[PDB]
Amino acid sequence: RRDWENPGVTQLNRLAAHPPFASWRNSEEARTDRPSQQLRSLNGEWRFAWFPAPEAVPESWLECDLPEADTVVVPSNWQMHGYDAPIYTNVTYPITVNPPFVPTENPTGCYSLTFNVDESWLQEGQTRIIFDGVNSAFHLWCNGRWVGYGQDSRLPSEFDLSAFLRAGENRLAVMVLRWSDGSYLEDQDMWRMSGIFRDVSLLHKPTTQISDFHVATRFNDDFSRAVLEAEVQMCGELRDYLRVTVSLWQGETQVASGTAPFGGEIIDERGGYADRVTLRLNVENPKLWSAEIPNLYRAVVELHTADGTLIEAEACDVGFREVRIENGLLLLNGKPLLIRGVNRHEHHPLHGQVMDEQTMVQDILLMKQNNFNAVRCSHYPNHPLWYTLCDRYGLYVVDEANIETHGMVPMNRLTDDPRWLPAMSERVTRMVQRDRNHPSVIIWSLGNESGHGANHDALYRWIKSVDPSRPVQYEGGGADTTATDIICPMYARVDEDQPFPAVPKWSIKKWLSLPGETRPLILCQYAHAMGNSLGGFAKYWQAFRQYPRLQGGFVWDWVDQSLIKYDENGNPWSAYGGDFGDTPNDRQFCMNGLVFADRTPHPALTEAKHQQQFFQFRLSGQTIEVTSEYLFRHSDNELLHWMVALDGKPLASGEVPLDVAPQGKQLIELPELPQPESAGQLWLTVRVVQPNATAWSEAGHISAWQQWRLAENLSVTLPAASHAIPHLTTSEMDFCIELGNKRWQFNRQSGFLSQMWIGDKKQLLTPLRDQFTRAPLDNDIGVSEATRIDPNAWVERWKAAGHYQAEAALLQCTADTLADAVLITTAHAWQHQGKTLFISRKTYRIDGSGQMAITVDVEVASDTPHPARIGLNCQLAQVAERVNWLGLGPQENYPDRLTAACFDRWDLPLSDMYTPYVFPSENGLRCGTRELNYGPHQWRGDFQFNISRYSQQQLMETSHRHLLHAEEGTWLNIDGFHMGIGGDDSWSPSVSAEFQLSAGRYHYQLVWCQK
């Protein structure tokens, strides 16, 4: 045997790891990166049968196809084809913890393929098969004979089939185990799936071949000169006539070249490597690589006889860059980086863990368009094309070993155990051997959430010895252990310390200066974008810009891991943990992305775009100061557009070319402006626009923006006198006010506005009443469960306090006739089990112009948990197509997540006012609004609001968006005040004190009128 229950056996007959090969036989095709006739794909239609345990597989399958097998596409994860269920568990392992054993019932995928091999491949050289990703462990047979075995789901397994194959038809048999001892090191927080989920290929190499090659680029002090050093190793027939020529190209121009015979310098008393050769090429004024300008060269490595026969050629894209930590700072090409990063899992809602070029490209475009410059491979080596794309489009990468043992207790139980050193070593070393020549990889990581064990210290040192060009990081065991060159915490807050024993999460600003500490700090995970979140994001960015050693971080995370399911009617819907019968499970914790699984953005993405801008601005008088945060390029594809508007109405605008050097400034003086007609606030908005398309953005792409309030002329102009006075009519149960075509009815038993008529049409489906709660966000719930309440979560604190069930008690309701209006005065108390939680006192003044001015003053008991909101709500009878407001927008914005929003006049379709979070909650709020228009109504004031076809009650009771149903009418929530949403993490309260409603007394006012 049971090799899959033995961590001492992680492979049998597997070839050594090495950088990407294609064995070209023509150097120009190697130079151009064209396809090679010696590298074939075996992707396509294969045969597959599912078995409940390896003991159930029939021997016959080795020799021939099973009649009951299906033909399926490979690569794939078998759960995506319905064979068995994917499981969504976060920390707790999906199997009983009893290493190194796995369950007797262990889903086994039997894959097979009959394929052709040309005779020419068998007349010479070696033919190997490569499986880029097999989850979790597998045995391979060729033509009925056993070839070998492999573990590690995330790196390639290569086997020499030379002696097993025959001309023409051949048949592969692959028996894939879902669970193996490798599973104890694969406990990442993601769907647990299995299968042959990365490409399968066949590669022909000559008998005398390039078996490995390492490319290094070293520089002089100002990066005006470099030496490219390429060490090449061969296997096979070593003879004096062999040579290696390494040539370096910048496009179609050859910039350098060197040729040498094999035989490295003397290494020790026994000599040197007669099978290795190191070529050193001098390159003057090299064009440097960065995420800003991903300049690349092409190195071609030719193995050939001295007299001119090319044996084979391999090759790679080279990016000239130096990565080093000096004086506490991580520098790239001598300048300190500011990492605008994101963690990105390999996830597709239809294909599972199978990646494709299109999806990868789509992700890199969106990342770049949203001002990200870096990505962490949470938490494993990625599909090979990912690196190629990050080298070409330009993203800094953290390459991470596939080692995560989160569910152990304590977390380092395996990583501190020498018996697991061998299995861990292969996960680290084979990754470095495969990905060490990609310029996009700038930092190596030892894996994730596996505590800190002595195995990490050994491996940290192994990487530092083999590759001195990149720092090594690892967060386990407290984020600043001896196994990391970078303090790289997860979810450490900006100012707040969380002093957990043994592994405290200090405020990042305090962490940098602890006694004796000198390393740079880059969070490996920060701001958990689960549901309506990212509150407090701007606090991180202000700190990063202020403190040199705070060099950024990687947002958690890029894309929700939701999967598509289909209902009885055949309509697709987004599913999360437990939706496949999987249990135990961790429900919606698999959805923490800035974008939905189909790549549609969540609102939080625009907040990240704005805080991660590369241009900063300051305003002084008529002067705008632009500062560039690029380190290497000048602003050669950018112009500044500016607009001054009065409450939404444009008054003046222009454009100015931007010419700012990296880290430089440009002062721009705006024109003499037209002093405004009417009253209101003037606002200046500026945007940086890229006129020319790029490889990653369209012409006109906006990359940065900022707004400022300019002059304000408060209105002192009196409204005209009205030719009318509203009339009051009273009964024991109501106060009715009439003014022309308008009527208002106040219920004297409840003390609320129960109905309004315009003309003779009823406007309300439910009365206008105070609201102190919200349908809880993922951050309000945290890890709380019905089955296991977490009393410290906001939602539980509100529930326990009775907020959700408190009943309004009427303390007063009066009506008075004024000179030109009717005034209704009310007071209510909300209580629970004898405790008065809130007191609401209001006045409603309806004048002869038909406007109703509502004044609200609320008292909140200092000892009840601060409430989610202080506002009013009602179900309007009308359903209108559009929503138009003067306030922050156009996207959803909350108090602690509104920096990206701009004050202007926005107008959207109603549905755009609802955000379809998979797990429904309060959503769609827009803050800082001065006027709201819907149908015939207009509300004016200074408030926050949401408007949609779904009640807060319905959102709190429904757990999946596809189950919500539009209600009659439109539910309007208009808040004087609304609590922050939080998001530094999604398992402990994270709303900062300044965003909690703790003032005790609150005042707000609204005018509701028609038009």
Residues that bind Na ion (CB under 5 A): 189, 544, 547-548, 550, 589, 592, 635, 638, 658, 920
Query: What tokens appear for 612 in the block?
Result: 């991660």
For residue 716, the partner it binds in a second copy, ligand 147, Mg ion, none, with Cβ less than 5 to 8 A by kind, is a second copy
The binder of 259, among a second copy, Mg ion, Na ion, none, by C-beta within 5 to 8 A per type, is: none
Residue 439 or 593: the one with the smaller Cβ distance to Na ion is 593
3-state secondary structure of 396: strand
- Closest to Na ion by CB, 301 vs 795, is 795
Give, as ranges, the residues between 409 and 438 that touch a second copy (CB under 8 A). Answer: none
* 404, 796, 975, 985: which one binds a second copy (CB under 8 A): 985
Residue type present at position 62: L
Cβ atoms of residues 541 and 897 within 8 Å: no
Dihedral sign (CA 161, 163, 168, 170): negative
Structure tokens at 11: 């492979």
Of 917, 934, 950, 1008, the residue at the interface with a second copy (CB under 8 A) is 917
Binding of residue 247 to ligand 147 (CB under 6 A): no
Is the N-terminal amide bond of 468 cis, ω within 30° of 0?
no
Only one of the segments 205-213, 263-271, 469-477, 489-497 lies at the binding site for a second copy (rule: CB under 8 A); that segment is 489-497
Q: Angle, to 10 degrees, between the axis of helix 454-466 and the axis of helix 421-435?
A: 30
Residues 473-502 that bind ligand 147 (CB under 6 A): 490
132, 158, 189, 796: which one contacts Mg ion (CB under 5 A)?
Answer: 189
- Per CB under 5 A, the segment of 8-16, 47-55, 293-301, 901-909 that binds Mg ion is 8-16
Closest residue to ligand 147, judged by C-beta, is: 189
DSSP E strand boundaries for 772-820: 807-817
365 or 656: CB nearest Na ion? 656
Which C-beta is closer to ligand 147: that of 525 or that of 951?
525
Nearer to ligand 147, 783 or 808 (CB): 783
What is the separation of C-alpha 27 from the centre of its chain, rounded to a whole number of angstroms?
40
Which among 578, 573, 601, 600 has a CA at the least distance from the CA of 588?
578
DSSP state of 851: -
Distance (Å, rounded) from C-alpha 755 to C-alpha 766? 8
Helix (H/G/I), strand (E/B), else coil: 953: helix
Q: How far apart are the first and last CA of the chain?
A: 82
Window 498-527: residues binding ligand 147 (CB under 6 A): 525
181 binds Mg ion (CB under 5 A): yes
x-or-dash pattern for a second copy, window 556-585, by CB under 8 A? ----x-x----x-----xxxx---------
Whole-number minimum distance, CB 259 to a second copy, in Å? 44
In whole angstroms, the minimum distance from the beta carbon of 691 to ligand 147 comes to 40
Contact 961, 914 (CB under 8 A): no
Residue 783 binds what, of a second copy, Mg ion, ligand 147, none (CB under 5 to 8 Å, by partner type)?
ligand 147
Q: Which parts of 368-397 interact with a second copy (CB under 8 A)?
A: none
With beta carbons less than 8 A apart as the criterion, state whether 529 and 592 touch. Answer: yes
x/- contact string, 962-991, with ligand 147 (CB under 6 A)? Answer: -------------------------x----
Instruction: List phi, psi (to 5°) of 826.
Output: -130, 160
Contacts 24+ apart (CB under 8 A), 601-604: 601/366, 602/529, 602/915, 602/917, 603/532, 603/891, 603/892, 603/893, 603/897, 603/915, 604/529, 604/533, 604/534, 604/537, 604/897
Give the 3-state secondary structure of 320-387: ECCEEEECCEEEECCEECCEEEEECCCCECCCECCCCHHHHHHHHHHHHHCCCCEEECCCCCCCHHHH
Quick check: 922 binds Mg ion (CB under 5 A)? no
| Residue 869 near Mg ion by CB under 5 A | no
Q: Does 833 bind Mg ion (CB under 5 A)?
A: no
Binding to Mg ion, residues 367-406 (CB under 5 A): 406
Kindly state the number of chain residues that form the binding site for ligand 147, as judged by CB under 6 A: 9
Please identify, using beta-carbon distances, which residue of 73 and 725 lies nearer to a second copy.
725
Among positions 399, 582, 892, 904, the unique one binding a second copy when judged by CB under 8 A: 892
361 binds ligand 147 (CB under 6 A): no
474 phi and psi, to 5 degrees? Answer: -170, 130
Q: Which does 236 bind (CB under 5 to 8 A by kind): Na ion, a second copy, ligand 147, none?
A: none
Q: Is 309 in the site for Mg ion (CB under 5 A)?
A: no
What is the footprint of ligand 147 within residues 781-820 (CB under 6 A)?
783
Cα–Cα distance measured from residue 522 to residue 368, given in angstroms and rounded to the nearest whole number: 19
532 in contact with a second copy (CB under 8 A): yes
Check residue 720 for interaction with a second copy (CB under 8 A): no
Asked if 145 touches a second copy (CB under 8 A), the answer is no
Nearer to Na ion (CB atom), residue 126 or residue 952: 952
Number of residues that bind Mg ion (CB under 5 A): 9
Site membership for ligand 147, residue 773 (CB under 6 A):
no
CA nearest to 702, candidates 685, 724, 716: 685
What type of residue is 314? Answer: E
Cβ at position 194, least distance to Na ion in Å: 20
301 versus 918: smaller Cβ distance to Na ion: 918
Q: Considering the complex, what minimum distance in angstroms separates the CB of residue 406 from Mg ion?
A: 4
Among 836, 875, 938, 958, binds a second copy (CB under 8 A): 836
**Which positions from 405 through 464 interact with Mg ion, judged by CB under 5 A?**
406, 449
The tokens of 517 are what? 């500490």
Report, in Å, the least distance between residue 593 CB and ligand 147: 10
Is 91 an interacting residue with respect to ligand 147 (CB under 6 A)? yes
How far from 637 is each of 47, 594, 633, CA to CA, in Å?
52, 27, 10
Size of the residue set binding a second copy (CB under 8 A): 108
- Could you count the other beta carbons within 10 Å of the beta carbon of residue 906? 20
Question: Tokens in use for 912?
Answer: 């755009």
Partner whose footprint covers residue 6, from Na ion, Mg ion, a second copy, none (CB < 5 to 8 Å by kind): Mg ion
Which of the stretches 205-213, 389-397, 818-826, 865-873 binds a second copy when contact is defined by CB under 8 A? Answer: 818-826
C-beta separation of 474 from 455 below 8 A: no
- If the CB atoms of residues 578 and 802 are measured against ligand 147, the closer one turns out to be 578
Q: For a second copy, which is the closer residue by CB, 173 or 872?
A: 872
Nearer Cβ to a second copy (794/919)? 919
Give DSSP secondary structure letters for 33-88. Answer: T---TTEEE--EEEEEEEESSGGGS-THHHHS--TT-EEEEES--GGGGTSS--EE
Candidates 191, 197, 526, 906; binder of a second copy (CB under 8 A) is: 526
Asked if residue 778 lies in contact with residue 602, where contact means CB atoms within 8 angstroms, the answer is no
Neighbours of 693 (CB within 10 A): 12
Nearer to a second copy, 156 or 520 (CB): 520
If contact means CB under 5 to 8 A according to the sort of partner, which of Na ion, ligand 147, a second copy, none does residue 635 touch?
Answer: Na ion
826 interacts with a second copy by CB under 8 A:
no
User: What's the DSSP call for residue 411?
Assistant: T
Give one DSSP letter per residue of 157-220, joined into a string. EEEE-TTT--SEEEEEEEEEES--GGGGGB--SEEE--EE-S-EEEEEE-SSEEEEEEEEEEE-
Q: Which does 9 bind (CB under 5 to 8 A by kind): Mg ion, ligand 147, Na ion, none?
A: Mg ion
Site for ligand 147 contains 829 (CB under 6 A):
no
> How far, in Å, CA of 177 to CA of 196, rounded?
10
- Residue placing its CB nearer to Na ion in the complex, 217 or 773: 773
> Cβ of residue 280: shortest distance to ligand 147, in angstroms?
43
Residue 509 in contact with a second copy, rule: CB under 8 A: yes
